[PDB]
GROMACS .gro file of C-alpha atoms in nm:
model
  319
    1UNK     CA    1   0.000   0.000   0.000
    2UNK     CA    2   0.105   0.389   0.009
    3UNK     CA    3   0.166   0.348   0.417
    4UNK     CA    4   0.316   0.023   0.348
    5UNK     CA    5   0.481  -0.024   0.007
    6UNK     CA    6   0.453  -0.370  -0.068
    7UNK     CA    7   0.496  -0.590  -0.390
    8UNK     CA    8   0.484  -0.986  -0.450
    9UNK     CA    9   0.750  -1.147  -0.636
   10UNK     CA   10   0.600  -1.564  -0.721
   11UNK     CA   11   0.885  -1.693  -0.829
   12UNK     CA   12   1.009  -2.058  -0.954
   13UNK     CA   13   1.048  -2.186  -0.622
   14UNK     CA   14   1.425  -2.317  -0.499
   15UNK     CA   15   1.463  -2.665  -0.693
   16UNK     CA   16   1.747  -2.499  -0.893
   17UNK     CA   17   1.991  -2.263  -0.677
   18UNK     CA   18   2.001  -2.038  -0.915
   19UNK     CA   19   1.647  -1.903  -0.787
   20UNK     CA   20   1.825  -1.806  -0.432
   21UNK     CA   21   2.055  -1.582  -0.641
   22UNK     CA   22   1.758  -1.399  -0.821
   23UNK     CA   23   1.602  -1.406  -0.435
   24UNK     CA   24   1.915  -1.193  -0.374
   25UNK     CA   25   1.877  -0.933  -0.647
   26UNK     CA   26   1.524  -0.928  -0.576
   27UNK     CA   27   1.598  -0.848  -0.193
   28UNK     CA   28   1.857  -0.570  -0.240
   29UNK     CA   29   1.649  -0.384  -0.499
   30UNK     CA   30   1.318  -0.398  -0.249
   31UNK     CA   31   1.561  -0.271   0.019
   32UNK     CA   32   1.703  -0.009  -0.193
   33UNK     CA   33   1.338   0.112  -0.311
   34UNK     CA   34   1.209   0.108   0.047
   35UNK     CA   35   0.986  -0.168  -0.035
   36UNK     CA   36   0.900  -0.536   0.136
   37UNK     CA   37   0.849  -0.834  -0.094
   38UNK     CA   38   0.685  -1.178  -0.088
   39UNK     CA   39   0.944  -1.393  -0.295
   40UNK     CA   40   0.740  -1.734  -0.290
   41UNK     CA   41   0.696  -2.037  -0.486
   42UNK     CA   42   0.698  -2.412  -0.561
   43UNK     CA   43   0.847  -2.682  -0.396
   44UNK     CA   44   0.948  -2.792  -0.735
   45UNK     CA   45   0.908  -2.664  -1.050
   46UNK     CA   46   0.643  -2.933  -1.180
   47UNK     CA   47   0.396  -2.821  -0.910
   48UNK     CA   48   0.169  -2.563  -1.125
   49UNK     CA   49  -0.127  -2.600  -0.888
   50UNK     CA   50   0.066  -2.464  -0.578
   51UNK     CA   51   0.210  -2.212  -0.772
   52UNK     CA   52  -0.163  -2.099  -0.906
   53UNK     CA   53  -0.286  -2.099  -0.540
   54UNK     CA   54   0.030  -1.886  -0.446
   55UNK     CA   55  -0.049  -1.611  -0.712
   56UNK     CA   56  -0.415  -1.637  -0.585
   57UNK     CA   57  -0.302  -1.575  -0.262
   58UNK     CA   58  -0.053  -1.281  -0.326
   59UNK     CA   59  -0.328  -1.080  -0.615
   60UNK     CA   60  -0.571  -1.083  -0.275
   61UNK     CA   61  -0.324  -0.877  -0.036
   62UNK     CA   62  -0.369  -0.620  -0.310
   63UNK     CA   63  -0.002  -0.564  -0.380
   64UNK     CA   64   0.142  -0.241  -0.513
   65UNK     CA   65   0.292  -0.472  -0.813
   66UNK     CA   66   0.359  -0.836  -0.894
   67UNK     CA   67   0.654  -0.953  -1.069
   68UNK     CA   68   0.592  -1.339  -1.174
   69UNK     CA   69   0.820  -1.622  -1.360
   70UNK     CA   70   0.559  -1.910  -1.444
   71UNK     CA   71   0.623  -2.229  -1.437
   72UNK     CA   72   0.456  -2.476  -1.679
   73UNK     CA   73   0.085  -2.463  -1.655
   74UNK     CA   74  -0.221  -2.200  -1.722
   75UNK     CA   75  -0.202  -1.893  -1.567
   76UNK     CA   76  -0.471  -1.715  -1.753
   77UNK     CA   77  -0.729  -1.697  -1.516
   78UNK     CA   78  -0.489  -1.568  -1.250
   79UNK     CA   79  -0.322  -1.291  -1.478
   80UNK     CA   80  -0.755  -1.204  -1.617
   81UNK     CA   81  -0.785  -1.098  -1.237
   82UNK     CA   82  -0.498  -0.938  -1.198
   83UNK     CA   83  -0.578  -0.705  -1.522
   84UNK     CA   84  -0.927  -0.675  -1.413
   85UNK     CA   85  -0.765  -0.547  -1.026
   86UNK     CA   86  -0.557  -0.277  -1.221
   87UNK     CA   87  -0.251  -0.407  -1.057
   88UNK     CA   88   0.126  -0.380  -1.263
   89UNK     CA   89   0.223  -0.676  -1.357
   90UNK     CA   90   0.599  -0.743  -1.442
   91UNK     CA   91   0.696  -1.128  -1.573
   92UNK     CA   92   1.089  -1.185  -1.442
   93UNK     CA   93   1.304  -1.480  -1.613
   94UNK     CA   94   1.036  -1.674  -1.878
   95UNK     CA   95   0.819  -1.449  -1.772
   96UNK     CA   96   0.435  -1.526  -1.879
   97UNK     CA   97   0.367  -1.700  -2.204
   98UNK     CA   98   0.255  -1.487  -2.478
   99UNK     CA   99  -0.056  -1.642  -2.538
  100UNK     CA  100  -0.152  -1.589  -2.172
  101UNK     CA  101  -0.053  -1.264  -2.123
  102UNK     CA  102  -0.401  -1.086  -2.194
  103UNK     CA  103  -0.215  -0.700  -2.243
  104UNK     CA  104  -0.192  -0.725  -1.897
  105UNK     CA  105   0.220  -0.778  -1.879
  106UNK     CA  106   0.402  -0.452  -1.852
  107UNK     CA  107   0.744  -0.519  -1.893
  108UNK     CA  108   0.949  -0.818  -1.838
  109UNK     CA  109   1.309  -0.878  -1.672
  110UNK     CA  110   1.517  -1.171  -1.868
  111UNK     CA  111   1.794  -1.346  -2.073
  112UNK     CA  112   1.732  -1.298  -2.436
  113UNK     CA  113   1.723  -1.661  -2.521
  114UNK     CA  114   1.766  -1.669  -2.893
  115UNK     CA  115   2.092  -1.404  -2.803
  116UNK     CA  116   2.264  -1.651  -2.556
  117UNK     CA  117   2.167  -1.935  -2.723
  118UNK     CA  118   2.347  -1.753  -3.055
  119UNK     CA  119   2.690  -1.718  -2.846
  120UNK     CA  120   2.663  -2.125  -2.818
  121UNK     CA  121   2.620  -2.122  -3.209
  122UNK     CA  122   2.937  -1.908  -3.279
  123UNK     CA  123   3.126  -2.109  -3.020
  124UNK     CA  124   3.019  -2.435  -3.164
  125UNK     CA  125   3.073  -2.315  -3.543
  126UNK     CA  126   3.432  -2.181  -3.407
  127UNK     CA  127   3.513  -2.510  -3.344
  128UNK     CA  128   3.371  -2.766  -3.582
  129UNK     CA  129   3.409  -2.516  -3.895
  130UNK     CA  130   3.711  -2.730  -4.004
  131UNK     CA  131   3.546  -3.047  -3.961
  132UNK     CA  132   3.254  -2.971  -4.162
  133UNK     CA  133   3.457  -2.882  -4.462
  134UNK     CA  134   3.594  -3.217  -4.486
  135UNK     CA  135   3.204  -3.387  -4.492
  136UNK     CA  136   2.982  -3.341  -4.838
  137UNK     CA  137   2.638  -3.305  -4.945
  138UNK     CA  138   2.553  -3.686  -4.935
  139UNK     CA  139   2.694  -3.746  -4.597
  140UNK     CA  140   2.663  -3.440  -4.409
  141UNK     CA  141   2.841  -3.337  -4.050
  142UNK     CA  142   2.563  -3.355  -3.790
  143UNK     CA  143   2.481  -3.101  -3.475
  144UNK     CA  144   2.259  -3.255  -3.240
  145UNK     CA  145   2.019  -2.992  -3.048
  146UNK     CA  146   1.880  -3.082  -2.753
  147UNK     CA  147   1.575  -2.854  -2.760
  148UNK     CA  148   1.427  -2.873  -2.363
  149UNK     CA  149   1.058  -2.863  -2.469
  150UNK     CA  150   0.799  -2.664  -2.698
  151UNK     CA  151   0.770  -2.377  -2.453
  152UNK     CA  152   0.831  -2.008  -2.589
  153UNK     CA  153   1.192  -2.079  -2.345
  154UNK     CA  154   1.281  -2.393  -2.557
  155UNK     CA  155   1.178  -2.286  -2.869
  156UNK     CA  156   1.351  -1.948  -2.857
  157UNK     CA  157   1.681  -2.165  -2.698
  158UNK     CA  158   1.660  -2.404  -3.004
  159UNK     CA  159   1.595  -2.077  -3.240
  160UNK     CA  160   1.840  -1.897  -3.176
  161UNK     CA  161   2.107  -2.177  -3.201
  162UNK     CA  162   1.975  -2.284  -3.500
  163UNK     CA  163   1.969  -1.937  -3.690
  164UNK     CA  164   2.290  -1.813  -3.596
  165UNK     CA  165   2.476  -2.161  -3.703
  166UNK     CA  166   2.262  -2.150  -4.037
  167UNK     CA  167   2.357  -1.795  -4.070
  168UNK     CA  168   2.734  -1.875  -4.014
  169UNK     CA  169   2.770  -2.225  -4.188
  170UNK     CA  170   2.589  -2.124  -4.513
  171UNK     CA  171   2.794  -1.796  -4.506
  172UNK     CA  172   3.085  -1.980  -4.531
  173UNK     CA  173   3.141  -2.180  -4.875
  174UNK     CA  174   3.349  -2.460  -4.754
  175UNK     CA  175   3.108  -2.560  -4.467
  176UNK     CA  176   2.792  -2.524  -4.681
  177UNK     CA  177   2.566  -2.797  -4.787
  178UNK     CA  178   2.798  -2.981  -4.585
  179UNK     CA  179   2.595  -2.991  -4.263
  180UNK     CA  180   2.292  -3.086  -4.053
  181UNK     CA  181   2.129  -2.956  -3.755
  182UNK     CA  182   1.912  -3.225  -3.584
  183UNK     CA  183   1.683  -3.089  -3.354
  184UNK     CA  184   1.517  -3.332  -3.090
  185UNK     CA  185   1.307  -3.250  -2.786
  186UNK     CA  186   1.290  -3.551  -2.545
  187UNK     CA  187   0.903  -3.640  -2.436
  188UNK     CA  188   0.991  -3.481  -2.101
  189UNK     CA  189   1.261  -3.357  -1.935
  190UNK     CA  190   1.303  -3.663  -1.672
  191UNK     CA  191   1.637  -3.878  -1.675
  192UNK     CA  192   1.564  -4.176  -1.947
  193UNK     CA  193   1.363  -3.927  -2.168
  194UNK     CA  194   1.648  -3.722  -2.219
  195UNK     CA  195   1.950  -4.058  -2.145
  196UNK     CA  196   1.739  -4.236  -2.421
  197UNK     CA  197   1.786  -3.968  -2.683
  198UNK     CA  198   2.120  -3.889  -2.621
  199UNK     CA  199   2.154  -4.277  -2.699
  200UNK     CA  200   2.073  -4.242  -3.026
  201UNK     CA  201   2.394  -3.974  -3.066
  202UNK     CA  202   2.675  -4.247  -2.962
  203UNK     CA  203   2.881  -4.467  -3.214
  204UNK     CA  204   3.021  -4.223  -3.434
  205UNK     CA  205   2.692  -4.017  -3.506
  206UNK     CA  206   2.711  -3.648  -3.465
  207UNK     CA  207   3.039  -3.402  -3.419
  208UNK     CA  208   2.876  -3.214  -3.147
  209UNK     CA  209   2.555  -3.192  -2.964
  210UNK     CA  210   2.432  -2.839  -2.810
  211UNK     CA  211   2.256  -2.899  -2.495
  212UNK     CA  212   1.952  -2.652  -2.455
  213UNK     CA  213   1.933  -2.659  -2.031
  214UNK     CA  214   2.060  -2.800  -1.718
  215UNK     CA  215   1.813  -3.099  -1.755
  216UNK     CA  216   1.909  -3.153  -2.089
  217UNK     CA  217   2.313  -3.167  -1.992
  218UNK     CA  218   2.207  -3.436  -1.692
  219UNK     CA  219   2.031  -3.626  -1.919
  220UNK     CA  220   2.382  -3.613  -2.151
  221UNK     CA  221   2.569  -3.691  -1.850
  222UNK     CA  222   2.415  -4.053  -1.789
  223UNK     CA  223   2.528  -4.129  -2.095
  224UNK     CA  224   2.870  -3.997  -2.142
  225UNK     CA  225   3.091  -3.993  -1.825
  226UNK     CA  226   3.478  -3.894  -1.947
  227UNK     CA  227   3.704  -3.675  -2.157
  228UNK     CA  228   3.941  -3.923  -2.163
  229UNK     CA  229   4.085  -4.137  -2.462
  230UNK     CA  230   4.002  -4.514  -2.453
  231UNK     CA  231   3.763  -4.478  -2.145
  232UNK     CA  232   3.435  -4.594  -2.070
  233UNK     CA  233   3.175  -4.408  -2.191
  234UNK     CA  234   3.424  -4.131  -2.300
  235UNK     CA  235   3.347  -3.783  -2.597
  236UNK     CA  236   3.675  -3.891  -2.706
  237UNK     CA  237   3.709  -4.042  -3.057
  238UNK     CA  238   3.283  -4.095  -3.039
  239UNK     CA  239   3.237  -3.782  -3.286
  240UNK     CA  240   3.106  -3.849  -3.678
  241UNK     CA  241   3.485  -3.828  -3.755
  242UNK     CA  242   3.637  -4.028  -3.551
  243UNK     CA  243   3.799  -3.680  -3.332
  244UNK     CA  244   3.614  -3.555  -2.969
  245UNK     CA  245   3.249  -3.489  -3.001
  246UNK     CA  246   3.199  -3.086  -2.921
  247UNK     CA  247   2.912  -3.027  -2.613
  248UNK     CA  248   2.805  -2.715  -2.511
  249UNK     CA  249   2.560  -2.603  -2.292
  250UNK     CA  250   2.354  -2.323  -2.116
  251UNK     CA  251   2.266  -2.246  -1.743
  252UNK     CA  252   2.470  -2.420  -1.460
  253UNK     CA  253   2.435  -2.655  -1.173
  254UNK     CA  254   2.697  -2.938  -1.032
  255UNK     CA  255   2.708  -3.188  -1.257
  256UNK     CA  256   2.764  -2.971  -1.547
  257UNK     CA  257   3.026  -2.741  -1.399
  258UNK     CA  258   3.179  -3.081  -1.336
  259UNK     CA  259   3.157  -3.196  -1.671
  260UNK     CA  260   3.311  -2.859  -1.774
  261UNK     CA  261   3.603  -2.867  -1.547
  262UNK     CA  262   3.652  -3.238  -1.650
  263UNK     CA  263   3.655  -3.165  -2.027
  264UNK     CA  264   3.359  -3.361  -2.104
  265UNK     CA  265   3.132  -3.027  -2.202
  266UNK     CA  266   3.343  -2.738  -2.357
  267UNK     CA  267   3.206  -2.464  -2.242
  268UNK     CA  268   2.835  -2.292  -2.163
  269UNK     CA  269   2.627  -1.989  -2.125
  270UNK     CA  270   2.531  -1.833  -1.772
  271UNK     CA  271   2.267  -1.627  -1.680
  272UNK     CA  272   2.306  -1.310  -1.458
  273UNK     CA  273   2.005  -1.408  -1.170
  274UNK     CA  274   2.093  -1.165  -0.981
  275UNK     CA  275   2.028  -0.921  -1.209
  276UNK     CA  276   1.749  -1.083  -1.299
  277UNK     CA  277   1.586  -1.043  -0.973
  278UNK     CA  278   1.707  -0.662  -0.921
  279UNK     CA  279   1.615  -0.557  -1.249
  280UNK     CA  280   1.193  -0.763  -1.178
  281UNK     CA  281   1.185  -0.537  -0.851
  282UNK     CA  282   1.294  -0.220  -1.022
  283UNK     CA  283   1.073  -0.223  -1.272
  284UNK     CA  284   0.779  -0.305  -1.027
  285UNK     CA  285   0.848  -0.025  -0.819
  286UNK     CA  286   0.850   0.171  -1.090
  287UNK     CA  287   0.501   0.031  -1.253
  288UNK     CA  288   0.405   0.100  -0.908
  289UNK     CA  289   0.492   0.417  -0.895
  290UNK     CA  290   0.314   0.522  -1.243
  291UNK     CA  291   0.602   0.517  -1.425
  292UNK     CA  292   0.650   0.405  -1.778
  293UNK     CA  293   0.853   0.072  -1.760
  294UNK     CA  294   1.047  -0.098  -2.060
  295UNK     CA  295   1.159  -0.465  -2.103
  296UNK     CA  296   1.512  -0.502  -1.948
  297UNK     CA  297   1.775  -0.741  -2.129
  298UNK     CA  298   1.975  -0.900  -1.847
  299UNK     CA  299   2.189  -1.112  -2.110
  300UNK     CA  300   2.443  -1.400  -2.069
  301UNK     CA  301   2.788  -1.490  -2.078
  302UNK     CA  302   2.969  -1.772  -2.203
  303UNK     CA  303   3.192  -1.933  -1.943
  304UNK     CA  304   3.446  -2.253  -1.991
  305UNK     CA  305   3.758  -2.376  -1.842
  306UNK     CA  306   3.932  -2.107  -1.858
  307UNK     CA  307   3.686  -1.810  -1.688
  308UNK     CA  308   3.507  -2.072  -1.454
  309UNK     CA  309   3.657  -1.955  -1.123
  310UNK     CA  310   3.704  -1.570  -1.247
  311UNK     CA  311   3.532  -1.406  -0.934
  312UNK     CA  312   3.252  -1.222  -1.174
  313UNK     CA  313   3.136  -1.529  -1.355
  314UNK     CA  314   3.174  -1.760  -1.037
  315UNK     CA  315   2.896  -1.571  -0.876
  316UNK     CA  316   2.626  -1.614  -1.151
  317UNK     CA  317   2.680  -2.019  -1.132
  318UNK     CA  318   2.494  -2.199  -0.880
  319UNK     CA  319   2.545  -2.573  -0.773
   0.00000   0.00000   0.00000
């Protein structure tokens, strides 16, 4: 309220560390705005109905704001009310889906996910560009992408891969023709749906395999298991052409900053959630405030080997 300034923030919920960091950002931009928050959600991401009821809950405190990060399910009745309650709404991370959005989202605080996803595709082209030349137009070099699901998120992650390496690989005459991207999306996002895929990609199949989310590199990571030559399970001599297969990634979590520091995965993209978290907060206030708000880019960085324990990348990775 005026006397109370006081804005709800329904987040993801905690099954991925990263969400504490964004709890962070969110925090220090409510203190610096002189305004308390509500950061709640989920136990885990797959429980929609709690997070409906916790969105219910916060829209009848009448909030100044809301800033909200959906998880999977329908939101639409939720985000009618709010519209019909003239409260701002801001959508943080994946935000709202379009098609649920009713004109009712003001401005949203995220990664660009076709833009991150397009550092993967120069990284990946970087490295493969010579291999591809030496492949032809009736047995072409393939690129595996893991695509996470058919979400705006994994579409736009898949996208944006997809156009930049097109753009990059047909630009250049002696990889062109000479390639394939193979997009899959595993039936969900559990362990054997994504294990079984990645199955399909052993035995000499593909020369590298972009991997869209954290799920999608466990998944990869039942599979293959070493970065070393003659070893069980091993990347090494299992690409298309007989060399290392090339995996990248995108977000964080143990096992994959494992995989990076043991050579297995070359290298990924990070999110900034703390930023992502300020920036929701800020531009709540501000829709609170009657200001006129704007979507914030809070962008991504590629990290690897060599820039994993750099203090300013360590702190957007989460275990």
């Amino acid at each position: 309220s005026n006397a109370d300034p006081y804005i709800a923030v329904v987040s993801k919920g905690f099954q991925h560390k990263f969400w504490v960091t964004v709890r962070d950002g969110a925090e220090a931009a409510a203190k610096q705005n002189g305004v308390k928050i509500s950061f709640v959600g989920p136990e885990t991401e797959s429980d929609s109905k709690i997070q409906q009821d916790l969105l219910d809950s916060e829209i009848n405190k009448n909030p100044d704001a809301i800033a909200f990060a959906a998880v999977t399910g329908d939101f639409t009745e939720q985000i009618k009310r709010i519209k019909e309650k003239n409260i701002p709404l801001i959508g943080f991370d994946s935000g709202i889906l379009p098609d649920q959005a009713q004109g009712a989202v003001l401005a949203t605080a995220s990664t660009d996910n076709r833009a991150a996803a397009a550092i993967v595709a120069d990284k990946m082209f970087e490295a493969l560009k010579t291999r591809i030349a030496a492949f032809t137009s009736d047995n072409k070099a393939k690129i595996a992408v893991l695509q996470l699901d058919n979400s705006d998120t994994g579409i736009g992650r898949a996208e944006g891969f997809v156009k930049r390496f097109t753009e990059l690989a047909d630009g250049d005459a002696a990889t062109a023709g000479k390639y394939a991207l193979q997009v899959i999306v595993p039936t969900t996002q559990n362990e054997a749906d994504i294990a079984n895929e990645v199955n399909a990609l052993r035995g000499k199949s593909v020369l590298g395999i972009y991997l869209s989310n954290e799920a999608m590199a466990r998944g990869f990571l039942v599979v293959y298991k070493s970065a070393e030559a003659g070893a069980a399970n091993t990347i090494v001599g299992d690409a298309q052409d007989g060399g290392d297969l090339v995996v990248m990634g995108f977000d964080s979590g143990k096992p994959q900053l494992d995989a990076i520091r043991n050579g297995i995965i070359q290298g990924s993209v990070t999110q900034d959630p703390y930023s992502i978290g300020f920036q929701a907060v800020t531009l709540a206030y501000k829709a609170s405030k009657g200001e006129s708000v704007s979507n914030i880019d809070t962008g991504a960085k590629w990290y690897d080997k060599t820039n994993i324990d750099d203090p300013e990348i360590a702190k957007l990775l989460y275990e």
